[PDB]
Design a protein around this nucleic acid. Structure first.
Ligand code: CL
Ligand code: ZN
Ligand code: ZN
Ligand code: ZN
Length: 121
DNA sequence: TGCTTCCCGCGAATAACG
DNA sequence: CGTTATTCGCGGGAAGCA
């Protein structure tokens, strides 16, 4: 297979047979394991690059379109990802967007065709 | 040390299946 | 199709890099 199981305190962990990383969720081990096997490939559809996780490709492709989905609700400035948004809000507004802050809005993705969560509309 | 990308629990969206 | 099985978007802390 691709893993073995470890059980401490009645709680189950799934361990990657290759690098021994531990996962609470089997789906996470599977997602991770592609890094080792390259069974599935996620090539960028704008350049040569190829990724081992679907989400790594998606975040990369947003860099190509230049879409700015993260918007600061205190001043209206928008950002390409959470990290730049969070960094802005902490440094400029001295506030933490963690928890449920209501300090930012994540717009739906319109520059790419990805799965759309209803809660963003 | 400030960008930049990675990581993984969680669960909504959707593909697979019967 | 209903139903369950799979995918992968998301937060936000960690790790990587120059
Ligand atoms: Cl935009
Ligand atoms: Zn591994
Ligand atoms: Zn690319
Ligand atoms: Zn702002």
């Amino acid at each position: 297979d691709d893993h073995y199981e470890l059980i401490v305190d009645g709680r189950v962990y799934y361990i990657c047979i290759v690098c021994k990383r531990s996962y609470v969720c089997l789906t996470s081990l599977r997602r991770h394991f592609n890094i080792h096997s390259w069974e599935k490939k996620y090539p960028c559809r704008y350049c040569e690059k190829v990724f081992p996780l679907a989400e790594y490709r998606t975040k990369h492709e947003i860099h190509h379109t230049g879409e700015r989905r993260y918007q600061c609700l205190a001043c209206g400035k928008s950002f390409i990802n959470y990290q730049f948004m969070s960094s802005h809000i902490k440094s400029v507004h001295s506030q933490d967007p963690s928890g449920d802050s209501k300090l930012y809005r994540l717009h739906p993705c319109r520059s790419l065709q990805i799965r759309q969560y209803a809660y963003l509309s």
